[PDB]
Design a protein around this ligand. Sequence first.
Ligand SMILES: Nc1ccn([C@H]2C[C@H](O)[C@@H](COP(=O)(O)OP(=O)(O)OP(=O)(O)O)O2)c(=O)n1
Ligand SMILES: Nc1ccn([C@H]2C[C@H](O)[C@@H](COP(=O)(O)OP(=O)(O)OP(=O)(O)O)O2)c(=O)n1
Ligand SMILES: [Mg+2]
Ligand SMILES: [Mg+2]
Lengths: 227, 226
Amino acid sequence: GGTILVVTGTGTGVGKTVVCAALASAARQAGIDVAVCKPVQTGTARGDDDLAEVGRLAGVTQLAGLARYPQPMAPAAAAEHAGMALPARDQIVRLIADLDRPGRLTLVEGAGGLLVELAEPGVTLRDVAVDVAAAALVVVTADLGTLNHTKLTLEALAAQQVSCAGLVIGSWPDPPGLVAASNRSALARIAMVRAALPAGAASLDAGDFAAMSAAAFDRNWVAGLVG
Amino acid sequence: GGTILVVTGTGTGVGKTVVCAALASAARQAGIDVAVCKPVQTGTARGDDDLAEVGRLAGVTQLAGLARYPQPMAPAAAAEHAGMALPARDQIVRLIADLDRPGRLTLVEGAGGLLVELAEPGVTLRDVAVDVAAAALVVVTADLGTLNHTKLTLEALAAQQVSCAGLVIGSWPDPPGLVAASNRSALARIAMVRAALPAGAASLDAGDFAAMSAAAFDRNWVAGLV
Ligand SMILES: Nc1ccn([C@H]2C[C@H](O)[C@@H](COP(=O)(O)OP(=O)(O)OP(=O)(O)O)O2)c(=O)n1
Ligand SMILES: Nc1ccn([C@H]2C[C@H](O)[C@@H](COP(=O)(O)OP(=O)(O)OP(=O)(O)O)O2)c(=O)n1
Ligand SMILES: [Mg+2]
Ligand SMILES: [Mg+2]
C-alpha cells in the first residue's frame, strides 16, 4: 500500500477541509497521487459537502464518501434525526483500504474533532487511525485557547499510539496579533508545525490556491510522505 | 481537611468563573463554608478579576490568588510579555492546601482549559489537582463541538487519575435550539450534568444570582460535597 493521513482538528470549524485541499494540492504538484476521503459527512441539507470543496479548490477527482446526513449536527445526532444509522467501523476502514495504494497519499478528513463518534459504538477517527495504521495531522487555530485544545488532542493521539504527523495552523491572520504570534511560537514547541494557511484561502482561485499551497508546505516534508 | 474541587473547562470563556460563583452560592445556602482560589489571573489591564466576581455574586470572602498579569493572554504568554515568571508549583499547591479545612468547600479555578501552564515549569491545573487530591468539575458549553471537547478533557483527567465530579453547562441559551438540546442529552451520556446555567447570569445582582444558583443544582449533591 501507500500512505494514509487522517486530517483531524482541535474542534469543528478549524480549517480541516482547506488543509486537506492545500496538502492534496501541494502533493499533486509533487507528482504524488492523492485521494481524499470523507467517510462521515453531516449537514448536507445546508449544502455542506467537504468532498466537493476539496475538488473545487484542489482539483482532486479521487473523492470518496460513504454516509451523508442532512442536519448539521454530531453524526450520532444527525443520524438519529434522519432515522438512519452510523456506519460500522469496518465500513470506514474498508472505504480507506480500497483507496490505499503504493505511491498514493490518501487524506481522511473526519467529522469535526478527534473524539467525535463516527461509527457505532463510540468508534472515533482515532480508532480508525489505529485500524489503517495512519498518522494523524492535526489542524489548529491561533486563537486563545488553542494550546490547551492541541495538547489535549495530542495526548489523545498518544493513548492509542497514533503518530502525530504534526500540526497545520488552519487560518493564519494577516497581520497576526500578539496572541496569535505567541501561540504560533508556543505550538511550534509542542509539535512540528507543517504550515500556516493564510486566512480566507477558500476564496483564492485554482492557480492562486495552488501557489499558496506549494508555498505553505515544505517540499521535502511532502515528498517524504510517500515513497 | 475538607473538600477541594478544581473547576476547569473545555476551553476559555465557557463560564468557569460564574460556575465557581453559582456552586459557591449553592453551598453557602446549604450552610457550607466556601473558599475560591484563583492562583493566576491575566487580563488585569482591562479589569479582569474573576475573584471579585465570585465575591459580588456569591458573597465569598475567602478569595485567594497569587499573581495578576495585565495582558489578556494565557498565563505563560502574559508572563513572558510582562517579564516575570509564573508562580512556582509549591506556591499554588500550598495556597490551596492551607485554604482546605474541614467543613469547607474549596473551589480552585484555573485559566482557560485543563492543560494550560499555570506555574513554572509547565505545571498545569491537572498537576495541581493531583497533588491536592482534588476532583475536577468540568464546565462545558452547549454548542456544536462540546462533545469532542468534553471527551478530550475527561480523558486527560482520568489519565492522571483525577476524578471527575461532573459537568456543568457554563451557559444555557434561550431558546435552546437543536444543537444545544441534543447535546444536553449527549453530554449526560458521558458524565453527570449537575447544572446548566442560564445565559446571562453574570449580569445578575447577588440576590437574584443567589436564587438562580439555589435552583440550578441538586440540593442533595451540593450538601454531599462536604
Ligand atoms: N486558511 C483558511 C481556513 C479556513 N477557511 C474558511 C472555509 C470555511 O468556510 C471556514 C472553515 O474552514 P473548514 O470548513 O475547512 O474547516 P472544517 O473542515 O474543520 O469545518 P468542519 O470541522 O465542520 O468540517 O473558513 C479559509 O477560507 N481559509
Ligand atoms: N450562565 C452564564 C455563563 C457565562 N456568562 C458570561 C460572563 C462572561 O462575560 C462570559 C464569560 O464567562 P466566564 O467569565 O464565566 O467564563 P470563564 O471563566 O471560563 O472565562 P475565562 O476562561 O477567561 O476565565 O460569559 C453569563 O453571562 N451567564
Ligand atoms: Mg470540513
Ligand atoms: Mg474564570
